[PDB]
Ligand binder design. Structure first.
Ligand SMILES: CCCCCCCCCCCC[N+](C)(C)[O-]
Ligand SMILES: CCCCCCCCCCCC[N+](C)(C)[O-]
Ligand SMILES: [Pr+3]
Ligand SMILES: [Pr+3]
Length: 392
């Protein structure tokens, strides 16, 4: 007795899995101060938790897409959910911060299953119209998690051990596993076919030769890096840096990620009467001004964290308005397999995130908020520079 009611259970559980992998990063960052204290490791390992998680997030997309096409979307997706559960529980037995960070990398591999197999099964399963609605819900979850995560995460370590968070991630994932086991269809259309790694290597070499595709893909990385660098480092900037509490830390997340949502909501309204190109130029203004204000203010006054938050909120508003559009143009900048293009642009932007967060970390360690913000400004200029070519 399962076909109508169990039709929308499949996207629902994939959304739940997407949610748990995202708070798997976003809840952990505030709780990371407790982790650092419990291992007696330096504060420099706080953003490295995210770096490793995102490094794992770019490790397998290239393989998982065409592999799940040959052996099945079901077994590969269920293997990803299981892997997440297992590595979530496995981090409880970590004996030092290096082992913690290593399992943080292994946990992040679970991200690769969302786009390359999960969402591919969505495209293959539903009509164009219904697929749009699921994609919309997936985008909403991506907006809520970086806001709810630091808030719940900061409140969590006030009462419960950080170990408990990973039990929560695995429990949520276990719910999604049983749901995906029952409701996910098999939609792989190349089952039985052999997979050629040499032939797959030729495909990725081909998209990287597309100059216009790479410019847009790097631009998505550079432009979102400030936001990710804030996510990675706000616990150490606010609590250990500014000598503030969890309350301030969490409160400052609201205007920033709230502006992100506001910029996406305005994007939804203006989408019928604006081209993707003009929305990028539209968002370009608050992106540049926001980053400029954050930089200038913390250079003249190192502890002007409210001005920093204000600048990042203005910038975040610009990202909400301009990001989805640039994703769209980058996807269509290469006339090649969507799975390959998606994986390539996911891989490229997460290379910039991982490298950039680590540079960002050293920037703040050596020069405080001024240098943290100046590096963010450079990333904006790099996005802006790529846009003058990508658009003109
Ligand atoms: C508009 C933001 C672009 C970031 C790309 C999304 C990467 C998902 C990785 C999960 C980490 C969550 N986070 C920090 C991005 O909110
Ligand atoms: C936030 C949900 C993600 C799954 C569906 C939307 C992604 C389709 C395009 C893939 C490339 C986009 N990006 C930002 C990951 O590079
Ligand atoms: Pr070929
Ligand atoms: Pr091919």
């Amino acid at each position: 007795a399962r076909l109508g009611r169990q039709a929308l259970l499949f996207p629902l559980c994939l959304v739940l899995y997407e949610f748990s992998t995202y708070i798997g990063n976003d809840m952990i960052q505030p709780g990371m101060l407790a982790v650092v204290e419990q291992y007696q490791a330096g504060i420099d390992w706080v953003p490295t938790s995210m770096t490793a998680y995102l490094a794992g997030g770019m490790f397998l997309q290239w393989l998982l897409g065409p592999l799940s096409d040959r052996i099945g979307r079901r077994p590969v997706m269920l293997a990803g959910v299981v892997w997440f559960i297992v590595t979530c529980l496995a981090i409880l037995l970590a004996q030092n911060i290096e082992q913690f960070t290593l399992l943080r990398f292994l946990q992040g591999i679970s991200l690769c299953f969302i786009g390359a197999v999960g969402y591919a099964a969505i495209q293959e399963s539903f009509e164009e119209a219904v697929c749009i609605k699921i994609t919309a819900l997936m985008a909403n979850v991506a907006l809520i998690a970086p806001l709810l995560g630091p808030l719940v995460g900061a409140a969590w370590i006030h009462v419960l051990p950080w170990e408990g968070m990973f039990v929560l991630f695995a429990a949520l994932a276990a719910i999604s596993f049983f749901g995906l086991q029952r409701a996910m269809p098999e939609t792989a259309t190349r089952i039985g076919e052999k997979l050629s790694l040499k032939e797959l290597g030729r495909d990725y070499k081909l998209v990287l030769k597309n100059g216009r595709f790479v410019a847009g893909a790097l631009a998505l990385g550079f432009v979102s890096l400030p936001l990710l660098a804030w996510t990675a480092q706000s616990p150490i900037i606010i609590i250990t840096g500014e000598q503030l509490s969890s309350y301030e830390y969490g409160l400052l997340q609201v205007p920033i990620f709230g502006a992100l949502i506001a910029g996406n909501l305005l994007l939804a309204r203006l989408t019928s009467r604006r081209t993707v190109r003009s929305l990028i130029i539209m968002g370009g203004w608050p992106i540049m001004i926001g980053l400029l204000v954050a930089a200038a203010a913390t250079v003249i006054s190192s502890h002007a964290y409210l001005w920093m938050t204000a600048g990042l909120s203005i910038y975040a508003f610009g990202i909400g308005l301009a990001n989805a559009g640039l994703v769209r143009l980058t996807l269509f900048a290469s006339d090649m397999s969507k799975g390959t293009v998606s994986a390539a642009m996911e891989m490229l932007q997460m290379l910039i995130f991982t490298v950039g967060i680590e540079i960002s970390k050293h920037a703040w360690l050596n020069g405080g908020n001024g240098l943290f913000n100046l590096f963010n400004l450079v990333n904006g200029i790099l996005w802006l520079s790529l846009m003058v070519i990508f658009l003109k």
